[PDB]
Amino acid sequence: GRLIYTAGGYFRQSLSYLEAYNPSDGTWLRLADLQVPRSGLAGCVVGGLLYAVGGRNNSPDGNTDSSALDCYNPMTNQWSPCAPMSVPRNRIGVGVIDGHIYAVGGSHGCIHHNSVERYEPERDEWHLVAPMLTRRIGVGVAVLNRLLYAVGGFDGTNRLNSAECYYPERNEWRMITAMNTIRSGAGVCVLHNCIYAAGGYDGQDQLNSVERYDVETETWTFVAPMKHRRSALGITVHQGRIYVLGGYDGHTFLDSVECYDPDTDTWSEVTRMTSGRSGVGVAVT
Amino acid sequence: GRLIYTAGGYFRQSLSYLEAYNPSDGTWLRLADLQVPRSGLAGCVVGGLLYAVGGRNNSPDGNTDSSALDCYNPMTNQWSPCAPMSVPRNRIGVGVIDGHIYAVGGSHGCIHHNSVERYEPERDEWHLVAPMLTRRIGVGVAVLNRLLYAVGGFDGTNRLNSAECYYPERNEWRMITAMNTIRSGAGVCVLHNCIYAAGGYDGQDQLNSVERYDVETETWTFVAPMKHRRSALGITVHQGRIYVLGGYDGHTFLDSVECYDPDTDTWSEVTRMTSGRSGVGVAVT
């Protein structure tokens, strides 16, 4: 039985929660808090451990960007720190290939990163790899065909619809087809053999459109939109469905989780989170 | 019969309040709202007018740091906009010398100023002076011996315990003995021939410790702590005692108002504010 973990987030301030949802039995577990709260962190799972990556600690009396890699062991219910990245990365995006975590972009004060770096858990070590062609924060990242896709984001000046793509063997980036919509702060995942970009923010409004990419065709095409507009949402994939958790809709911070069945191209409200929030990290183990 | 004014502040949202405490009769006055709400502004009285400088407006419509200089006449109960500063300054520090308003440091977005500028109320004009040795936001400013003292703060990377000192005749900044604690957003004031620093935030906890500086001794000795830990507290002096107002204690936004008596090295709670808040501007008429 697999769990949907959500870590951190932000409501009034950056938060320390680690909670898991069991999609089959519908229950929420409250697990050990993060030592340092963050929002706009990124989550992933590699060999049984859950990792919280980057983010920023927005407190009422100060912000500080995180460079931290934090490592949660579900069997011990314990967090503990791992070697940190070369720089702090707020509104980071993350993807895993062959058991190595790739940290792509994000902000550090005024820097909007285009650098990316790769954590080897066997060595507890980070090394940098080729930077993207574009500075992106609030980026979406997905792995497809052992390639890393970096979708949308914000470059310090323009919100993006461009998307580029990384070749681990060759260590080079290439732009790919741009999206129909400008999307900073979207949720991005792969499901079956396509990359989905859900919600986000286009410069005027938060979105509920979902468009999806196809390497065969090399185009983005929309699918059923979500019930709730949302930006800075969490996203993961479980069984054969997309799960979006949380986000800011322009007015309130959502507790809504939406599930997307592609067989039927419809979204439904499955569970709600124990409290609304934005900018979670999400992963499945 | 003189008054302690408190302006703006923050609770869930930047605030508009202008209220005034009467330390003799123990009563609170509700005066005209500010026109834009603001937290992290500073206040000063020069010329029987009250001035509200800079700050930030956190509304659910967005963020915007202020370069405003707003000016309240207490015989008319009216705020009027005066000339704005060169540059927005959130978590600003202010001190008056010879009826001229020094706006020290502060932040604008990602930028952490060391710029300083001096308002002339007569001409209604702002001009820059020698910028300080250290980027400082959340800085406490005190005026002692016709010199301008910038205590602690945050420089965009670390919180600070360094203090430095402006020489207006000479137009230059020299550094002074650093504090024992690092404090961003403390309350800094002058009492007797002492520069006091109470409270603050060291990127980690809130503070209840209080130290004073002694230009003859050139050292920073500790004195009695406050009952409550306060960061982004409002401070002022009246009839030979220090008054600290509200702040964040890490958990709630304090309405507590404490009063330090230097004769007995003790604090005591005088009246609470009407609603708890932090990041207020405070002046005495």
Binding site: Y10, S39, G40, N58, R91, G138, F154, R159, S184, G185, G200, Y201, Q206, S231, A232, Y248, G250, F253, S278, G279 | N58, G62, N63
Partner: peptide, 7 residues
């Protein structure tokens, strides 16, 4: 704040 609502 418009993409994430933070302050």
């Amino acid at each position: 704040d418009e993409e994430t609502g933070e302050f």
